[PDB]
PDB file of C-alpha atoms in Angstrom:
ATOM      1  CA  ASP A   1     -33.086  -1.657  -3.293  1.00  0.00           C
ATOM      2  CA  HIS A   2     -33.021   1.930  -4.442  1.00  0.00           C
ATOM      3  CA  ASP A   3     -29.729   3.048  -2.898  1.00  0.00           C
ATOM      4  CA  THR A   4     -28.029   0.064  -4.212  1.00  0.00           C
ATOM      5  CA  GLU A   5     -29.398   0.584  -7.769  1.00  0.00           C
ATOM      6  CA  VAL A   6     -28.182   4.156  -7.755  1.00  0.00           C
ATOM      7  CA  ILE A   7     -24.750   3.314  -6.450  1.00  0.00           C
ATOM      8  CA  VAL A   8     -24.225   0.411  -8.961  1.00  0.00           C
ATOM      9  CA  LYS A   9     -25.431   2.498 -11.857  1.00  0.00           C
ATOM     10  CA  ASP A  10     -23.104   5.257 -10.730  1.00  0.00           C
ATOM     11  CA  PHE A  11     -20.222   2.763 -10.541  1.00  0.00           C
ATOM     12  CA  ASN A  12     -21.072   1.357 -14.219  1.00  0.00           C
ATOM     13  CA  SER A  13     -21.308   4.968 -15.550  1.00  0.00           C
ATOM     14  CA  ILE A  14     -17.973   6.038 -14.356  1.00  0.00           C
ATOM     15  CA  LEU A  15     -16.405   2.717 -15.468  1.00  0.00           C
ATOM     16  CA  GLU A  16     -17.673   3.459 -19.025  1.00  0.00           C
ATOM     17  CA  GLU A  17     -15.404   6.502 -19.021  1.00  0.00           C
ATOM     18  CA  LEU A  18     -12.267   4.412 -18.388  1.00  0.00           C
ATOM     19  CA  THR A  19     -10.999   4.644 -21.950  1.00  0.00           C
ATOM     20  CA  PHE A  20      -7.580   5.534 -20.878  1.00  0.00           C
ATOM     21  CA  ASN A  21      -5.347   5.181 -17.722  1.00  0.00           C
ATOM     22  CA  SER A  22      -7.354   7.770 -15.782  1.00  0.00           C
ATOM     23  CA  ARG A  23      -6.008   8.254 -12.274  1.00  0.00           C
ATOM     24  CA  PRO A  24      -9.107  10.210 -11.108  1.00  0.00           C
ATOM     25  CA  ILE A  25     -11.476   7.665 -12.401  1.00  0.00           C
ATOM     26  CA  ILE A  26      -9.567   4.684 -11.095  1.00  0.00           C
ATOM     27  CA  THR A  27      -9.118   6.364  -7.714  1.00  0.00           C
ATOM     28  CA  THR A  28     -12.750   7.302  -7.505  1.00  0.00           C
ATOM     29  CA  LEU A  29     -13.917   3.818  -8.400  1.00  0.00           C
ATOM     30  CA  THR A  30     -11.507   2.502  -5.531  1.00  0.00           C
ATOM     31  CA  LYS A  31     -13.147   4.908  -2.949  1.00  0.00           C
ATOM     32  CA  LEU A  32     -16.734   3.819  -4.268  1.00  0.00           C
ATOM     33  CA  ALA A  33     -15.567   0.177  -3.603  1.00  0.00           C
ATOM     34  CA  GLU A  34     -14.186   0.947  -0.116  1.00  0.00           C
ATOM     35  CA  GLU A  35     -17.392   2.882   0.840  1.00  0.00           C
ATOM     36  CA  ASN A  36     -19.955   0.431  -0.531  1.00  0.00           C
ATOM     37  CA  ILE A  37     -18.592  -2.979   0.331  1.00  0.00           C
ATOM     38  CA  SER A  38     -22.197  -4.146   0.557  1.00  0.00           C
ATOM     39  CA  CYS A  39     -22.320  -3.693  -3.241  1.00  0.00           C
ATOM     40  CA  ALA A  40     -18.954  -5.537  -3.796  1.00  0.00           C
ATOM     41  CA  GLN A  41     -20.219  -8.433  -6.010  1.00  0.00           C
ATOM     42  CA  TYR A  42     -21.815  -5.849  -8.262  1.00  0.00           C
ATOM     43  CA  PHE A  43     -18.691  -3.947  -8.697  1.00  0.00           C
ATOM     44  CA  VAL A  44     -16.806  -7.178  -9.332  1.00  0.00           C
ATOM     45  CA  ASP A  45     -19.265  -8.091 -11.986  1.00  0.00           C
ATOM     46  CA  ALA A  46     -19.212  -4.767 -13.603  1.00  0.00           C
ATOM     47  CA  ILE A  47     -15.221  -4.708 -13.845  1.00  0.00           C
ATOM     48  CA  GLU A  48     -15.074  -8.413 -15.128  1.00  0.00           C
ATOM     49  CA  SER A  49     -17.786  -7.673 -17.671  1.00  0.00           C
ATOM     50  CA  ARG A  50     -15.897  -4.483 -18.860  1.00  0.00           C
ATOM     51  CA  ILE A  51     -12.708  -6.507 -19.135  1.00  0.00           C
ATOM     52  CA  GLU A  52     -14.439  -9.111 -21.138  1.00  0.00           C
ATOM     53  CA  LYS A  53     -16.371  -6.759 -23.287  1.00  0.00           C
ATOM     54  CA  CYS A  54     -14.373  -3.727 -24.058  1.00  0.00           C
ATOM     55  CA  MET A  55     -11.614  -3.593 -26.685  1.00  0.00           C
ATOM     56  CA  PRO A  56      -7.907  -4.357 -26.370  1.00  0.00           C
ATOM     57  CA  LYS A  57      -6.238  -1.150 -24.816  1.00  0.00           C
ATOM     58  CA  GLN A  58      -9.231  -0.390 -22.787  1.00  0.00           C
ATOM     59  CA  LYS A  59      -9.133  -3.853 -21.101  1.00  0.00           C
ATOM     60  CA  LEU A  60      -5.749  -2.966 -19.455  1.00  0.00           C
ATOM     61  CA  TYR A  61      -7.332   0.059 -17.737  1.00  0.00           C
ATOM     62  CA  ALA A  62     -10.249  -1.919 -16.454  1.00  0.00           C
ATOM     63  CA  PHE A  63      -7.614  -4.418 -15.020  1.00  0.00           C
ATOM     64  CA  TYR A  64      -5.884  -1.417 -13.456  1.00  0.00           C
ATOM     65  CA  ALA A  65      -9.348  -0.536 -11.798  1.00  0.00           C
ATOM     66  CA  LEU A  66      -9.437  -4.202 -10.454  1.00  0.00           C
ATOM     67  CA  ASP A  67      -5.736  -3.859  -9.340  1.00  0.00           C
ATOM     68  CA  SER A  68      -6.388  -0.673  -7.525  1.00  0.00           C
ATOM     69  CA  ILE A  69      -9.525  -1.871  -5.715  1.00  0.00           C
ATOM     70  CA  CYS A  70      -7.700  -5.096  -4.619  1.00  0.00           C
ATOM     71  CA  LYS A  71      -4.500  -3.514  -3.545  1.00  0.00           C
ATOM     72  CA  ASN A  72      -6.091  -0.620  -1.727  1.00  0.00           C
ATOM     73  CA  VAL A  73      -9.167  -2.003  -0.345  1.00  0.00           C
ATOM     74  CA  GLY A  74      -8.431  -5.693  -0.039  1.00  0.00           C
ATOM     75  CA  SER A  75     -11.015  -7.988   0.976  1.00  0.00           C
ATOM     76  CA  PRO A  76     -13.786  -8.898  -0.072  1.00  0.00           C
ATOM     77  CA  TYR A  77     -12.550  -7.905  -3.468  1.00  0.00           C
ATOM     78  CA  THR A  78      -9.192  -9.844  -3.283  1.00  0.00           C
ATOM     79  CA  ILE A  79     -11.277 -12.866  -2.554  1.00  0.00           C
ATOM     80  CA  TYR A  80     -14.118 -12.263  -5.180  1.00  0.00           C
ATOM     81  CA  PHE A  81     -11.817 -11.344  -8.244  1.00  0.00           C
ATOM     82  CA  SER A  82      -9.601 -14.394  -7.459  1.00  0.00           C
ATOM     83  CA  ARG A  83     -12.338 -16.727  -8.809  1.00  0.00           C
ATOM     84  CA  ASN A  84     -12.236 -15.666 -12.349  1.00  0.00           C
ATOM     85  CA  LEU A  85      -8.669 -14.063 -12.269  1.00  0.00           C
ATOM     86  CA  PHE A  86      -6.878 -16.666 -14.247  1.00  0.00           C
ATOM     87  CA  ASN A  87      -9.392 -17.088 -17.061  1.00  0.00           C
ATOM     88  CA  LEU A  88      -9.954 -13.359 -17.251  1.00  0.00           C
ATOM     89  CA  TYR A  89      -6.242 -12.588 -17.322  1.00  0.00           C
ATOM     90  CA  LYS A  90      -5.355 -15.335 -19.816  1.00  0.00           C
ATOM     91  CA  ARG A  91      -8.127 -14.363 -22.200  1.00  0.00           C
ATOM     92  CA  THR A  92      -7.162 -10.803 -21.980  1.00  0.00           C
ATOM     93  CA  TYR A  93      -3.473 -11.474 -22.674  1.00  0.00           C
ATOM     94  CA  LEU A  94      -4.474 -13.529 -25.788  1.00  0.00           C
ATOM     95  CA  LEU A  95      -6.387 -10.646 -27.092  1.00  0.00           C
ATOM     96  CA  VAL A  96      -4.156  -7.622 -26.576  1.00  0.00           C
ATOM     97  CA  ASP A  97      -1.077  -6.303 -28.375  1.00  0.00           C
ATOM     98  CA  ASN A  98       2.483  -6.990 -27.053  1.00  0.00           C
ATOM     99  CA  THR A  99       3.081  -3.804 -25.426  1.00  0.00           C
ATOM    100  CA  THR A 100      -0.139  -4.324 -23.391  1.00  0.00           C
ATOM    101  CA  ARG A 101       1.181  -7.676 -22.559  1.00  0.00           C
ATOM    102  CA  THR A 102       4.366  -6.277 -20.893  1.00  0.00           C
ATOM    103  CA  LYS A 103       2.069  -4.038 -18.790  1.00  0.00           C
ATOM    104  CA  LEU A 104      -0.164  -7.094 -17.929  1.00  0.00           C
ATOM    105  CA  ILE A 105       3.139  -8.934 -16.950  1.00  0.00           C
ATOM    106  CA  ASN A 106       4.330  -6.214 -14.732  1.00  0.00           C
ATOM    107  CA  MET A 107       0.915  -5.933 -12.968  1.00  0.00           C
ATOM    108  CA  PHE A 108       1.101  -9.760 -12.398  1.00  0.00           C
ATOM    109  CA  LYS A 109       4.570  -9.361 -10.880  1.00  0.00           C
ATOM    110  CA  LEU A 110       3.479  -6.835  -8.380  1.00  0.00           C
ATOM    111  CA  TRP A 111       0.472  -9.115  -7.420  1.00  0.00           C
ATOM    112  CA  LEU A 112       3.179 -11.590  -6.148  1.00  0.00           C
ATOM    113  CA  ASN A 113       4.293  -8.968  -3.431  1.00  0.00           C
ATOM    114  CA  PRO A 114       1.560  -6.262  -3.301  1.00  0.00           C
ATOM    115  CA  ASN A 115       2.671  -3.010  -1.396  1.00  0.00           C
ATOM    116  CA  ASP A 116       5.748  -5.012  -0.398  1.00  0.00           C
ATOM    117  CA  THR A 117       3.784  -7.111   2.111  1.00  0.00           C
ATOM    118  CA  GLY A 118       5.483 -10.433   1.163  1.00  0.00           C
ATOM    119  CA  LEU A 119       1.940 -11.983   0.689  1.00  0.00           C
ATOM    120  CA  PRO A 120       0.403 -12.731  -2.716  1.00  0.00           C
ATOM    121  CA  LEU A 121      -2.650 -10.478  -3.605  1.00  0.00           C
ATOM    122  CA  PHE A 122      -4.860 -13.250  -4.769  1.00  0.00           C
ATOM    123  CA  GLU A 123      -5.556 -16.930  -3.968  1.00  0.00           C
ATOM    124  CA  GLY A 124      -2.204 -18.760  -4.637  1.00  0.00           C
ATOM    125  CA  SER A 125      -4.001 -21.079  -7.157  1.00  0.00           C
ATOM    126  CA  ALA A 126      -4.942 -18.394  -9.686  1.00  0.00           C
ATOM    127  CA  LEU A 127      -1.451 -16.802  -9.570  1.00  0.00           C
ATOM    128  CA  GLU A 128       0.242 -20.249 -10.146  1.00  0.00           C
ATOM    129  CA  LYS A 129      -1.964 -20.788 -13.206  1.00  0.00           C
ATOM    130  CA  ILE A 130      -1.219 -17.411 -14.506  1.00  0.00           C
ATOM    131  CA  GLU A 131       2.512 -18.041 -14.033  1.00  0.00           C
ATOM    132  CA  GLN A 132       2.340 -21.232 -15.933  1.00  0.00           C
ATOM    133  CA  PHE A 133       0.466 -19.672 -18.613  1.00  0.00           C
ATOM    134  CA  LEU A 134       3.065 -16.767 -18.980  1.00  0.00           C
ATOM    135  CA  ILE A 135       5.804 -19.315 -19.130  1.00  0.00           C
ATOM    136  CA  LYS A 136       3.961 -21.144 -21.968  1.00  0.00           C
ATOM    137  CA  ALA A 137       3.862 -17.689 -23.725  1.00  0.00           C
ATOM    138  CA  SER A 138       7.487 -17.075 -23.627  1.00  0.00           C
ATOM    139  CA  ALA A 139       6.549 -14.330 -21.222  1.00  0.00           C
ATOM    140  CA  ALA A 140       8.013 -15.409 -17.846  1.00  0.00           C
ATOM    141  CA  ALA A 141      11.139 -17.298 -16.964  1.00  0.00           C
ATOM    142  CA  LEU A 142      11.667 -20.990 -15.940  1.00  0.00           C
ATOM    143  CA  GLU A 143      10.930 -20.847 -19.789  1.00  0.00           C
TER     144      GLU A 143
END
């Protein structure tokens, strides 16, 4: 489809500019995700691809994009990102510096109680696997 193509390319183009913790960009990507749920899977793959491809510090900001979309838009993104969340998170964690790791850890903590709703942001399975991994990395308690 034409409109789909344009919207997806526009999403990717903006995402390429996420080289730092840009509030305007993250918020703009979240609004695009809210307004084009029909392109959700395209946005998910674009973000997961960026997290996997880009380098260390930039991987965090792409995860902040993923975080904003899930916390503010919710479904179907919370469902879609849940599938590769653990592998993506663990791989990123293993490839970034320790300061970035504390940021990934704080982000994970808020996924357990997003917006103080008392309901985990993602599939319980993904979050438990991430918690186990963090414990095995001396990064979460129950050491």
